[PDB]
Amino acid sequence: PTALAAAKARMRELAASYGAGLPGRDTHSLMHGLDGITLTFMPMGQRDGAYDPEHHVILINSQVRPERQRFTLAHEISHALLLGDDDLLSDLHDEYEGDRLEQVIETLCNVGAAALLMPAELIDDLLTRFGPTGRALAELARRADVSATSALYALAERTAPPVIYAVCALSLTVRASSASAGVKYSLSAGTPVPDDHPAALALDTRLPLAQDSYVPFRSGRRMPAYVDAFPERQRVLVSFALP
Ligand SMILES: [Zn+2]
């Protein structure tokens, strides 16, 4: 189809290679796959991590918390992977150039990290066991050890039916949100969340609930849907399933 869309597709595959040659996807595993490359953690200020290709060396900020350290790595690997490919890296200078080309890149490294941390197979494995549910999300994130928001988007891209996924924290407030396939009813951040809503009941009752209800659209209009909430340390993850 479009360039980016096919470009995205490729950058997905490359991950699939790199890490198909791996024993899982914990941090240290992703490091051992580094085919003769210098990998160093130090303090880099506000810099998360940079990849110097001529010294074949990755740098990750030792200061930042672990999760992003892990993410940064996947992202900067994807940096690595890319430049490793000419047929792709070429296609890019064919429909893009300038800062454009830069902004595009980093979005792919992002797309990269995505896949490289959360395999297309760990997701379907979960969707299969728990369905498209707040629960599923809660696991993938745990199991993958990634950010509530990272899963959110991953989980959705690989979902058949109309369904919305949403993270929630107390002020409630939607924090992030994503919708599968061809659902064009969107749910913003900031969107407040009523105390009567099943999602809430589940937080100060740290109790996994599952029942019908609606999408608490901030435009007031209650759209009906099946909801499955899974609460945890300060947040509840939530799957609205549109009929
Ligand atoms: Zn980058």
UniProtKB/Swiss-Prot annotation:
Q: Which residues form the active site?
A: E76
- Keyword Protease part of the UniProt annotation: yes
Keywords from UniProt, A to Z, are: Hydrolase, Metal-binding, Metalloprotease, Protease, Stress response, Zinc
Q: Name one GO biological process term.
A: proteolysis
Please summarize what the entry says happens upon disruption of the gene.
Answer: Deletion mutant is radiosensitive.
UniProt keyword annotation of Zinc present: yes
The reported result of mutating H28A is: No change in radiotolerance
GO terms, molecular function: metal ion binding; metallopeptidase activity
The residues that hold Zn(2+) are: H75, H79, E106
A Pfam family the protein falls into: Peptidase_M78
EC number(s) given by UniProt? 3.4.24.-
Control of this protein's activity is summarized as:
Protease activity is inhibited by EDTA.
Tell me which PROSITE patterns the record gives: HTH_LACI_1, ZINC_PROTEASE
Record's function text: Plays a central regulatory role in DNA repair and protection pathways in response to radiation stress. Acts as a site-specific metalloprotease that cleaves and inactivates the repressor proteins DdrOC and DdrOP3, resulting in induced expression of genes required for DNA repair and cell survival after exposure to radiation.
The UniProt subunit note reads as follows: Interacts with DdrOC.
Q: Show the domain comment.
A: Composed of three structural domains: an N-terminal zinc-peptidase domain, a central helix-turn-helix motif, and a C-terminal GAF-type domain.
Could you tell me what this protein is called?
Radiation response metalloprotease IrrE
Source organism: Deinococcus deserti (strain DSM 17065 / CIP 109153 / LMG 22923 / VCD115)
| Organism classification | Bacteria, Thermotogati, Deinococcota, Deinococci, Deinococcales
As recorded in Swiss-Prot or TrEMBL, the protein's gene is named: irrE
